Structure 1
């Protein structure tokens, strides 16, 4: 067993015939992500106000799920290269190149504050004087 003289060896392969790019989608554990309840998802480049340079939009379950923004890694490595290693039924290891690292973070749902009504103005008057009623009058 493991507590004894256990030795194990696996073959490692790095295929070149792959055509699909491999990317990382990272979450905070503090965000308590639950893939088990992701029934459906969308993933599209999203910068409609401004393809390969674009950040991501991740949309789970549509109107009844969470939505995230995907941001590009702060730079390529300058010494090492991150590789993805997968186990194969034959009993080998299989290694895959990372093309890119994207960071995904919480967007919120239908909250809509909108400081365009007169809230920048109201702030001028604000003495931490109100808080609830302004969110309601919208």
Structure 2
């Protein structure tokens, strides 16, 4: 059929400027990120430093859902550029430079030991009993 020898060629357009900047969001494969449950999400700059040069914080489904932290790619693409092709009704490809690259990793939510609490465990760090029990006590 035609698919056995189909040939597709489309024009490339590079708008001089766009109101919205383009950046790449990357999720590790082991994270098994799924967008079906992403009913709501929040993306904002971090508050630990306390803006344009600070890490980004991603929250999904408010506090109930998983939380991810994005960090700008330190390595710069001085000799390289990245572009994204998006299908359009006119049938011509459009390429947008990648303003930034961000790597997001999940943040597990649970009663993580506080800094003060960890000090007590440091005494028994070398010799501890029933690693499971330590979390139950906390």
| 8 Å CA contact 1:47, 1:55 repeated in 2 | no
**Structure 1 unaligned regions, length at least 5:** none
The Cα offsets for residues 39-64 of structure 1, whole Å up to 9 and x where unpaired, read as 10000100334411010110000121
CA distance in 1, matches of 2:32, 2:83: 26
| 4+ residue segments displaced more than 3 Å | 1-5, 118-126
Range that drifts further, 93-102 or 71-80: 71-80
TM-score (ref. length: structure 2): 0.86
Deviations 1:46-105 (A, max 9, x none): 033441101011000012100011111122213221011111111111111111001100
Closer/same/farther in 2, CA of residues 77 and 2 from structure 1, 3 Å limit: farther
**Normalising by the residue count of structure 1, what TM-score does the alignment of the two structures yield?**
0.86
* Structure with a larger share of its residues in strand: 2
Q: Which runs of 5+ in 2 are unaligned?
A: none
CA RMSD between the two structures: 2.1
